[PDB]
Amino acid sequence: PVLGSVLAIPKRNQAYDKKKLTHLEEHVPLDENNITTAHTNPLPALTKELQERYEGGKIYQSDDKYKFVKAGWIFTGLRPDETIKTDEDTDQPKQYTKGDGYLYYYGDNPTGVANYTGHWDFVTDVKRERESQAFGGGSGYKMDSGFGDEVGATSFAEQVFGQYAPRQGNHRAVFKADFDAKKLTGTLSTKQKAIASSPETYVDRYDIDATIKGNRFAGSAIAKNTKSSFLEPNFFNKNADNRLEGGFYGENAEELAGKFLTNDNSVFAVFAGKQD
Amino acid sequence: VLGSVLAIPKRNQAYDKKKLTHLEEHVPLDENNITTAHTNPLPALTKELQERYEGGKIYQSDDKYKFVKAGWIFTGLRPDETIKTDEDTDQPKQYTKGDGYLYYYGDNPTGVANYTGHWDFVTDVKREREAFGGGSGYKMDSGFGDEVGATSFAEQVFGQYAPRQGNHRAVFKADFDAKKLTGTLSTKQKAIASSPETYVDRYDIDATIKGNRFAGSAIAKNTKSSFLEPNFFNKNADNRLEGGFYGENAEELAGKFLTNDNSVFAVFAGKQD
C-alpha cells in the first residue's frame, strides 16, 4: 500500500437520548478510507486547517527530530471537559469534545544490515464502554480523562509521571533492517513510570515483521499481549496482519517511517526510526 | 540555501486604560521578515538607518573575518527613550525609539578542519515571560527582552558598556569526509571585577554538509526556564539551521538558525585554526 506518506484523524463520540434511554453513538471505529495520502509535507496544510477552524486555538505538534522523516501528531483542543453541543432541537442531537487533530507520517527523498532507533505514535478507536462497573476511558488505560471514550486515545495522552499536556518521548521504536534477507523487524514499546521514585520501565506493545522490496517495506504488526480485561485493560490486543507499510528515506536508507492499522480498526499507528 | 540573510529586532507597545489590557503582549519572530541578501547588505542597512534616524549614531559589529560577516547594526536603542503615536485613536502606540538588524553574509562561496569565531542573536519580545520578561533576571540591559528583542550586545558582562562584543563564542568542527558539521556556541559570563571569565554552553550544532552548504539543527543545552532560572535559550532549531563555507579552501563559514517557537534568531561565523 505504497506511499510517500499518510494521514488520519482522531475521531469523536457523542451523546444521549433522554426518551429512548440509548446513547446516540457507542462505537466509533477507524476507517481506512479516511486515511488521506500525502504527496508533500502535510503539516502546512493541517496547521492551516486547524488555524481556520479553531481560530485563536493553540496548536500542539510533535517535535521535528528526524532529517528526512516525519511521524507524529498535531492538534487543537483537546480538553474533554470542554464540549460542543449542536442540534438539540432535533432528533440526532450532538455533543463532541471541542477541538480536532491529525496523526501523520511523511518522508522526503526516498531511497547490508543496519539498525534503527526512533519512536511511534498512535490513535485508537473510541468506545463509551470497553471493559466490564464498566469503562472505555482514561485511567484503567493510563490515559488522561476522556481519551478512549470521548476522543480516540493517543500517545501524548498516555500518562507518565511529572509530564503534562501533550507528552512526548514515552513511545520507543527499534528496528533491524536486513537488506540481504530482505527483512524488516523491530519492536515498539511504551515507557511507564508511576511516581517520582519509580524506575523508567518499558513494556513491549508491538513486534514488527515486514518484507523489504525496493525502498519500500510491508508486512505485519504483532500484538505482544492480545489480552484485555477489566483489571488488565489493553488497547493493543489486535495485530495488523499484512496491514503495515512504510519505507526508507535518505540516500543510504538513513531513515525509515511508516504506518499500520489494526485488523479490527482499533489502533492506527505511525512510526519512524533512524540509524545508529 | 543562501548567500546571506537578514532580520529585525522587533518591538512591543502599550496599554489600554479603559479595558485594562495591554495592546501587545507577545511579538514572535517571523521567518517571512527574513530578507535574503545577494550582496553585502550593510551599505543598504546603514543607509536605511541614516535616512530614518537622521543624526543617529550607528553601532555595528566589528568586521574581523575575511570573506564572512555576521552580527548586528542599530540606532537607538535606549528603552528609556520611547516614541508614542496615535493616542487620539483606538490602537495607540509606544515603541522604543530606534531600529536595528541582525545579519550574516558571505563573499566567494566554495579532509577535516576546525573553526573558531562567534555568534549573535535576537530574541522575541514578551512583556511577561516568567513576573518579568526583561533584563536582569536574564542578565540583559533594561528593556531588552520585554520592550525590544534581547540581543548579544545587550547581554551583560562586567565593565563593558553600550553594545558589547566578544562575549559570545562559536566553535566548529568540519568533517568533509563524513559530511558533518558540529560545534558549540557559548556565552562569557563574568559578574564582578574579581570574577573569572566563565563560559556557559547555549547551543550545540548538528548539521549535514552537502556542497559548500550545510544544514541541520541547533540544540539547546538547557531546555529549562524558570523564575529563578530564566532562560531565553530553551528551544532547539530542529532542522532550522543553515549556512555555508566561504573562501576557496573552506577558509571560513557562516550561517543562521531560527528556533522552533520563533523565540531566538541567531547568526554565526567561524574561521580555521
Determination technique used: X-ray
Nearest CA in chain B to A70: B239
C-alpha–C-alpha distance, residues A64 and B129, integer Å: 24
Q: For an interface test with A, which of B210, B214, B238 has the most A Cβ atoms less than 10 Å from its Cβ?
A: B238
Domain holding A153, by residue range, is 112-276
Q: How many CB atoms lie within 10 A of CB A47?
A: 15
Residue for grid cell 534616524: B53
> Looking at this protein, which amino acid is placed at residue B139?
K
Q: In this structure, are B88 and B167 located in the same domain?
A: no
Chain A neighbours among B 190-229 (CB < 8 Å)? 208, 216-217
- E strand or H helix at B103: strand B99-106
Cβ distance of A64 and B239 shorter than 8 Å = yes
A–B: how many Cβ contacts below 8 A?
A: 11
Q: In this structure, are A103 and A170 located in the same domain?
A: no
Q: In this structure, are A243 and A209 located in the same domain?
A: yes
Q: Mention every residue, 6+ apart, whose C-beta is less than 8 A from residue A48.
A: none
**Number of compact structural domains in chain B:** 2
Q: For an interface test with B, which of A43, A67, A68, A249 has the most B Cβ atoms less than 10 Å from its Cβ?
A: A67
Cβ distance of B216 and A64 shorter than 8 Å = no
Tell me the shortest Cα–Cα distance from B218 to chain A, in angstroms: 11
Put simply, whether B258 touches A (Cβ < 8 Å) is: no
Which member of B208, B216, B238 has the closest CB to residue A63? Answer: B238
Put simply, whether A251 touches B (Cβ < 8 Å) is: no
C-alpha–C-alpha distance, residues A40 and A21, integer Å: 47
A chain contacts of residue B217, beta-carbon cutoff 8 Å: 65
Which domain-ending residue is among A90, A111, A132? A111
C-alpha–C-alpha distance, residues B51 and A86, integer Å: 58
CA end-to-end span of chain B? 26
Cβ distance of B238 and A64 shorter than 8 Å = yes
CA B153 remoteness from chain centre: 9
Q: In this structure, are B93 and B127 located in the same domain?
A: no
Q: For an interface test with B, which of A41, A43, A60, A65 has the most B Cβ atoms less than 10 Å from its Cβ?
A: A65
Q: In this structure, are B123 and B71 located in the same domain?
A: no
Put simply, whether B110 touches A (Cβ < 8 Å) is: no
Q: In this structure, are A158 and A220 located in the same domain?
A: yes
Q: In this structure, are A196 and A236 located in the same domain?
A: yes
Q: Is B50 helix (H, G, I), strand (E, B) or coil?
A: helix
Burial tier of A158 (Cβ tally within 10 Å: 0-12, 13-18, 19+):
buried
Enter the C-alpha cell of residue A33. Answer: 478510507
Tell me the shortest Cα–Cα distance from B46 to chain A, in angstroms: 36
CATH number at residue A26: 2.40.128.250
Put simply, whether B91 touches A (Cβ < 8 Å) is: no
Q: In this structure, are A176 and A149 located in the same domain?
A: yes
C-alpha–C-alpha distance, residues A50 and A75, integer Å: 7
Prior bond to B20 cis, omega within 30?
no
Q: What is the dihedral sign for C-alpha B150, B10, A46, B256?
A: negative
C-alpha–C-alpha distance, residues B127 and B143, integer Å: 10
What length is written for chain A?
A: 276
Q: Which among B40, B74, B44, B46 has a CA at the least distance from the CA of B254?
A: B40
What is the full DSSP assignment across A110-147? B--EEEEEEEEEEEE-EES--B---B-SSSTTSB-TTB
Q: In this structure, are B151 and B265 located in the same domain?
A: yes
Which domain-ending residue is among B88, B110, B132? B110
What resolution in angstroms does the PDB record give?
Answer: 2.9
CATH number at residue B253: 2.40.160.90
Q: In this structure, are B227 and B203 located in the same domain?
A: yes
Q: In this structure, are B178 and B104 located in the same domain?
A: no
Which domain-ending residue is among A55, A80, A111? A111
Residue for grid cell 506493545: A205
Q: In this structure, are A99 and A229 located in the same domain?
A: no
